[PDB]
Amino acid sequence: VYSYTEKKRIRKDFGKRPQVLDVPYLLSIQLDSFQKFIEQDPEGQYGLEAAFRSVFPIQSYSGNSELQYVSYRLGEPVFDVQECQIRGVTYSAPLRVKLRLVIYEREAPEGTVKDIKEQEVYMGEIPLMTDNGTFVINGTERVIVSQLHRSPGVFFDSDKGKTHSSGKVLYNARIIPYRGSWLDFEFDPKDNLFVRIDRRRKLPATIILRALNYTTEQILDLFFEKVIFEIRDNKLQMELVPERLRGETASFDIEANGKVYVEKGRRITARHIRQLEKDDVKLIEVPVEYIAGKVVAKDYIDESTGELICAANMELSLDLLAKLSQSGHKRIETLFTNDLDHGPYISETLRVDPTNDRLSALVEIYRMMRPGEPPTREAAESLFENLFFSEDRYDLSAVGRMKFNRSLLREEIEGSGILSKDDIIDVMKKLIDIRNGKGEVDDIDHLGNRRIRSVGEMAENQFRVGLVRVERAVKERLSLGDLDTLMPQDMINAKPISAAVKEFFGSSQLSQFMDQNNPLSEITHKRRISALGPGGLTRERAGFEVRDVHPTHYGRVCPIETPEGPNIGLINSLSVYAQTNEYGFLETPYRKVTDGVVTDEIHYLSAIEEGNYVIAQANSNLDEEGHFVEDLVTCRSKGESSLFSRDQVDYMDVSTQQVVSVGASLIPFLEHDDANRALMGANMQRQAVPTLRADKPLVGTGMERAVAVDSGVTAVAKRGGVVQYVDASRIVIKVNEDEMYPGEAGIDIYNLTKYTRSNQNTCINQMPCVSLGEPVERGDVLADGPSTDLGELALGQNMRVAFMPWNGYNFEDSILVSERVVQEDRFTTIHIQELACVSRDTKLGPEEITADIPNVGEAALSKLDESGIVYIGAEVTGGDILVGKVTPKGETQLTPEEKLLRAIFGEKASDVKDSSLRVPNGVSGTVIDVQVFTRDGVEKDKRALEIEEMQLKQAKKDLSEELQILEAGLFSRIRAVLVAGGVEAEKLDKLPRDRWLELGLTDEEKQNQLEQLAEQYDELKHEFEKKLEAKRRKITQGDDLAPGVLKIVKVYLAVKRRIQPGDKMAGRHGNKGVISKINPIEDMPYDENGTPVDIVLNPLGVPSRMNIGQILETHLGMAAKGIGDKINAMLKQQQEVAKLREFIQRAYDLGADVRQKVDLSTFSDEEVMRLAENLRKGMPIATPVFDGAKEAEIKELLKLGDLPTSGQIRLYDGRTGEQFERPVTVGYMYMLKLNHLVDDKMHARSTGSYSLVTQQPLGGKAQFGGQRFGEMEVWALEAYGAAYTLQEMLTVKSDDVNGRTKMYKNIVDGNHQMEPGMPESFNVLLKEIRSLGINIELEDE
Amino acid sequence: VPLDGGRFATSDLNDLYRRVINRNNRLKRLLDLAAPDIIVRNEKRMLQEAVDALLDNGRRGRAITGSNKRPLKSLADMIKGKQGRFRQNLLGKRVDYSGRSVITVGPYLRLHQCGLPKKMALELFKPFIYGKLELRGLATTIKAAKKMVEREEAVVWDILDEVIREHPVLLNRAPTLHRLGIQAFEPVLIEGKAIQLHPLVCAAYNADFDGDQMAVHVPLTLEAQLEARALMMSTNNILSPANGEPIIVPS
Amino acid sequence: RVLDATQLYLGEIGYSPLLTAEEEVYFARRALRGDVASRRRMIESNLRLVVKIARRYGNRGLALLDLIEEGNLGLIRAVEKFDPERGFRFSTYATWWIRQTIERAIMNQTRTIRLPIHIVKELNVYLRTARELSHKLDHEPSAEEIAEQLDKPVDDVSRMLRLNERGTAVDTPALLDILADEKENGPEDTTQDDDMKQSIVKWLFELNAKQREVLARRFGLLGYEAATLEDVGREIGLTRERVRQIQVEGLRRLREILQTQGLNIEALFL
Amino acid sequence: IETPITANFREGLNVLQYFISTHGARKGLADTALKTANSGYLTRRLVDVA
DNA sequence: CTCACGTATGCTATAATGTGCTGACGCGG
DNA sequence: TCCGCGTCAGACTCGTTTATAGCATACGTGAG
RNA sequence: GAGUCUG
Ligand SMILES: [Mg+2]
Ligand SMILES: [Mg+2]
């Protein structure tokens, strides 16, 4: 069972592992997230609903007035994506919000029966996400990259040494909210617990408990176990807990009953402990000297006097014991604190704590955050409560509370966003447990602690900031104003919210120009995760541990896709099957294994859930519809991998591909490639420019089709049915009755995007896939995007490649290409460049866009038309004028020479200059399109007006054809309904279709169908009118531009660039090269058959590189093409459909254990010859990643092609005709032309403009810049002799102003003499040091 | 200075000077007005804050943030940092008669030669062309010589061929770790946009042709030409200055 | 560790006495009569009020301290022109003065290019109008839409909104190195002017003796001052027609000297 | 790492061997970006001194 | 020689009088 | 606790928000 | 300055 577009061309699958779950929608993250932000939920606080309920209702400081939120609504977008992109505006919806101003009486207690004013106010336009996953901001397609941050909750960490060469591990807890101040607990080398509020100055940890109203004895009862001391008769006794001693050394002779258990001065082993516990020991007699040092728990006072004998937490002595006895206390609660397991930390922290009561603690906290400002009690209570116990300033969020509760081993997930007194103590408890040795530190790099924020969360946050700024303004105006005249909209400002959101979608680091070189570039960019930007790491901050692959990255993050650069490890591509859990942790699918049998039940497990189960590997062999074949299966748990028995196995990897990301999944024999080279391979696939002819990959993986479809660049059929009309512009499909709804007319129109500019100035062109009158299903590819073959992703072009040296023309990765490649226009690439000409208004006057330009040849003005605009279709070259522009010059006081010169030619040419937009030098192209943007008030150019005439008439035609095809399609249905119960075939066709409003039939369900079709017809009739009025308004609409700007003319050039020496090419195994020479066909190594090789690559760039994938790709590529050459031969000789069918079935069903079955037969003869015609230019094969083709399968395929098993062939030198002395590996490598063309990089400069302050030449080719002569380059001249070359570079070549002109004159005069001076940079340095008030003088000879 | 857009752009020193002048003049005012001393003090604190921000911003505690939030660049900041003036504009500079392009092999070359693209060399030797053009009397003046080059006339190629003869050009590759990261060659004019490098020197540059680029520099003076031909020529720098061994080694 | 200039000043203000009604009247009568202590105490006691207005005037132009100091200047003028005879309170009168001086300073100092209060006041009305338009028009105000509402000239509205365009630091997001010196000519252009100026001297000693004595003394090439056709008469020519015939006769023979040397149309483009 | 990679590139790595390879690979690549700075800083200190 | 034009300093009276981001690099002296 | 360091060039793109009474006399230079 | 890159 294959789909229609697959019947045209089937890829042979060498995969063996049946896929239980298909690749999901790849642009799932961006769409779900943003959809949640705009999604209207009444309850589920997501995006805007949450944002309003959080801030609102805002009540005044006086408390008379309050503003409350009702609901919001997004207006429909003013401009479609198309008009936004052309005009250079943000694609957004207006946000209208219903708000109710309610007012209370001050005289009545809280009477709400005074004034309720409800109105719908504008607060900004919110940018909308495209169906593809992008935002159009100021006419540029941009993607907002998902972020990876430390999850709110608690984290227990520890400086592993670092501080104090003592080398003490100091443990710390950090409580991180989603919003609020951070709460730190930490240890000191002296084992004192400290609190840092908001990482300010240090305070003793106990101070925070005093602020929460804890007495000393209550604190001690919380952290410490009590030990009771009974004073009986004269001897001292204490209540023993059998274990407590445990691993201690007995300081006294321990006697129980009458009989001695411990010997004094010996270590108490397990036997002593079990003996004591079984004997039921509860009292033991002890010496008085053992209590010297024990800490009293409670306050003990003299019942006689009523004064304190000893305060809580006080070190006991022999005399305090005596005083306690004689007062009448024969029971003393003392702290259990035996070092080791139970450390006295809080006991020692209370002794360091200078504060006494609650107030004294609150004052000291207040004095830390606000040092200097005198305390008040109300101020200190307010500040402390407003830190972590205010609903408005503190919010852990659901994820914070959930991770917090799980870290403290709770049962309940959900709870308060504010910190409870219990929370803080539990955290301190766990900290101290970890110090004692029971309990462990959480890992920051662990994905269980790293959470994903996609768009909607981030848009939500910026939107809350906007609201908060508004709340101050609103509350301020509610208090000042009279309440009754004043309506809510005069208080609200839209500009703060609009500004917050604008700054996110435009200024933000995560909002970046979509990487649109090719479909894969786009799709991978939209599934990016960055640890950088706001609320994240910095390159400075970023260490080595975060960057490296973490164990938990398995199935969630790609290990082999990360920028090789400063961003190495902070930016991560998402894995294939990976997805975000409800809280925003990453999760991966796994097949449940029940009683050893491996079900199709599939569970997404988070990073933390994964640790708990044993997961079998995907390559683990299952036995035909039940359990594992092998007894000891290779699995992984607790983040590490080994053999397990079958009963132990809980789960298994869903696919072999789930570890890898999208980009790397497209690499065929990844299994045989070094991970480094593979990284650069996946990275260069993103740089691949789509060629003029999009060629499929012969050696693919199968992700090719998934990527092409999910990217959105292909037009895919929603409804299916039969194609009514193809055109190089549009596809109209007539829908099938089964999916076709009986309401609207059932004709789908897909308009194709023709040759349009990309962000990287590449070309975006959609061509139609299907022919006129082709039946198609839902999800069939209707039109191919730029780098896509019939549904599959086609980033470049496969080529006959031979590995062997040439005469050094492939020296270090250098590539030797045949002229045939250039001739066949393979790797010829299309670049559409957008040039704008801006007419501004200056102090002197407005600039004119006339063809009337001072000092210009008729050659130049020939190409400009009446207005001063180049004609459509005109070929242009550097220096040709595209849009003529002249600028008003104010009164030119001329040099006498210019007075003479202007007098001689009399070409005074008025008071005007020449600022015309001309083609940049060396770029050459054909003008494909021109756009004119004018202001509303200013009189339109002749050329602007004829452009609007075209757009108007074209609009009219488009809408007219809509209503015509929709009416024809709709009456074609009425015709079929009327036949149902009323045979009038020939009689209905004769009377006009326009007079069918009269026509009905008997009152049944079919009469109601006629009413549906009649109401739709008229609905479309008026709809067509209001659509046309909208179009006409937008075409006439004068655009509001930047201030100063009267009009703008945008010219679009089309440049065809040929492949050429210097151009950069690569494969998909990270194998790069620069083309060194284009060899004549005659010269290139050729086969016994006479067929020349296309590309000659260097053997020596393989064994060092350890990317063996390229060689396997080449052997299989030749085998693929071997079978294509057999099918090509059989199609040339027509032959039998039966015979073709035989060969092709034997071919598809070759592999030793091929998963994919192809029961050819069912294919009709017509389907088979269309299939062979596609297979002729080489049978496409799919080698999944880690489940790829085996060497033996490739050699078997080669034998089917009658090609050699070695995949090496005899080659003959094109030049000499003699044979090469040994066989050469030849086959087909799929090759890519990257964006790095020599055309764009070549630059040269003799003299140019110079910098403002430093007077040195500028940098960069765009500014016509000199190459930087850096410290490093200077030192080289210092090492040599070269003193004159160095001075040259310092002086006449850079700053020295007089020197450079004088030496220019000398070089034209042919003197070749320097005449050096003083570099202007140094003159500046002097001025800058004197500006500091340091006298720096030059002292003369 | 006025940007093209009609807008202006200014140094942050102007914002810091304006701070200092406003507060200083306000201090003069409050002294003329005999203000109470608490307010005089506040103004004297603010004046010292403004001068300290102007001299060295960020040293006296929290630096004064301008328009974005980024701290204003003060006087000391223009001298101090690597980016100051020392490392950036003085110990190294941007340079005239300098170009770059992708490198590619020239196996046909001899050790002392390099393929230099026609259009690149045309531009780098512009004054040398102007000069020969006027000595042959083919160009009446400089402006006419410029327009003859712009038109890229056939006689100009022949003159350019004549100038480049025996004129050495410096090739440089980043990073320049040791002195052989700069070498002089005699250029060979070639059609096409890529620089052609001799294989045997690829070792010294650490040049592999998978897209690496090189800087070209023209030694102008007779002295600089001679220092390039004698000291810096490829042929003359065969042994590594680090160890005695030949750097020019087949691979 | 109180180091901050702001927190120091606000500490000093808190340390002041707060005034009542009868106390304000007593000090105010003595203050206008010219008491030293009365003026100082009224100022120092009312500093807290300046802070209140200065607090709700931050993040608009100057810093809190800057506004606090300028606001203090308003306090002084308030104490100078206070009327204790009127039963109405000081706080009410002072609030006007403090807001006036702060606003005025914020309109002047804030903007790098000093914008006059006249234009600033007009700008106020344009922007308030834009806000009311934005609330009802879901989109933002156009220049023409604002102009329609105020019944004012489109050009005047555009000039105003242009002046609103703020300039960011060139060194800050560098731009300095992108932007070239437009006033400085490249050595290429400067060398071309040298060639022209040198050729002129040689061209002056190639024509007639009376054809380069009135052609150069007019343009100011050899002479000292650039005269006109009528002003060449001051030397020896003393003619208007004969000066204009001879000026152009010098240029016609020189036009053929540039056609033969090989410029004319060659040096016409340039 | 205590478990070595038994296989070679001709044989092909499995998912676990490849994932384990990545660690060394990426640390190598990050080393070239980050460590180059200290090498170069040493060159510059040496140059200034001599 | 006189007025308009551009720019600036002036005054207004219910009472109101105390502030307020981002955190985390790592080695040496 | 503070302050000082942390390779060398190259390519491109983006980007420059905020609210601030109205009106009368006074001070000063330019244009007709 | 914040980017994504090429050595
Ligand atoms: Mg390299
Ligand atoms: Mg390399």
Curated annotation (Swiss-Prot), chain A:
GO biological process: DNA-templated transcription
Modified residues (N6-acetyllysine): K1021, K1199
Reaction(s) catalysed by this chain's protein: RNA(n) + a ribonucleoside 5'-triphosphate = RNA(n+1) + diphosphate
PROSITE patterns per record: RNA_POL_BETA (PS01166)
Any coiled-coil regions, as ranges: none
Quaternary organization: The RNAP catalytic core consists of 2 alpha, 1 beta, 1 beta' and 1 omega subunit. When a sigma factor is associated with the core the holoenzyme is formed, which can initiate transcription.
Reported function: DNA-dependent RNA polymerase catalyzes the transcription of DNA into RNA using the four ribonucleoside triphosphates as substrates.
Family to which the UniProt record says this protein belongs: Belongs to the RNA polymerase beta chain family.
Protein name (record): DNA-directed RNA polymerase subunit beta
Species assigned in the record: Escherichia coli O157:H7
Taxonomic lineage of the native organism: Bacteria, Pseudomonadati, Pseudomonadota, Gammaproteobacteria, Enterobacterales
Gene: rpoB
UniProtKB/Swiss-Prot annotation, chain D:
Outcome reported for the amino acid change (mutating F9C): Resistant to antibiotics salinamide A and B
Mutagenesis or variant effect for A25 to T/V: Resistant to antibiotics salinamide A and B
Post-translational modification: Acetylated on several lysine residues in the presence of glucose.
Protein origin, superkingdom: Bacteria
Application notes: Co-administration of salinamide and rifampicin or salinamide and myxopyronin suppresses the emergence of resistance to both antibiotics.
Function description: DNA-dependent RNA polymerase (RNAP) catalyzes the transcription of DNA into RNA using the four ribonucleoside triphosphates as substrates. Resistance to the antibiotics salinamide A, salinamide B, rifampicin, streptolydigin, CBR703, myxopyronin, and lipiarmycin can result from mutations in this protein.
Family: Belongs to the RNA polymerase beta' chain family.
Assembly and binders: The RNAP catalytic core consists of 2 alpha, 1 beta, 1 beta' and 1 omega subunit. When a sigma factor is associated with the core the holoenzyme is formed, which can initiate transcription. The rRNA transcription and antitermination complex (rrnTAC) consists of RNAP, NusA, NusB, NusE (rpsJ), NusG, SubB, ribosomal protein S4, DNA and precursor rRNA; S4 is more flexible than other subunits.
Protein name per Swiss-Prot or TrEMBL: DNA-directed RNA polymerase subunit beta'
Organism field: Escherichia coli (strain K12)
Name of the coding gene: rpoC
Region of the whole protein represented: 755 to 804 of 1407
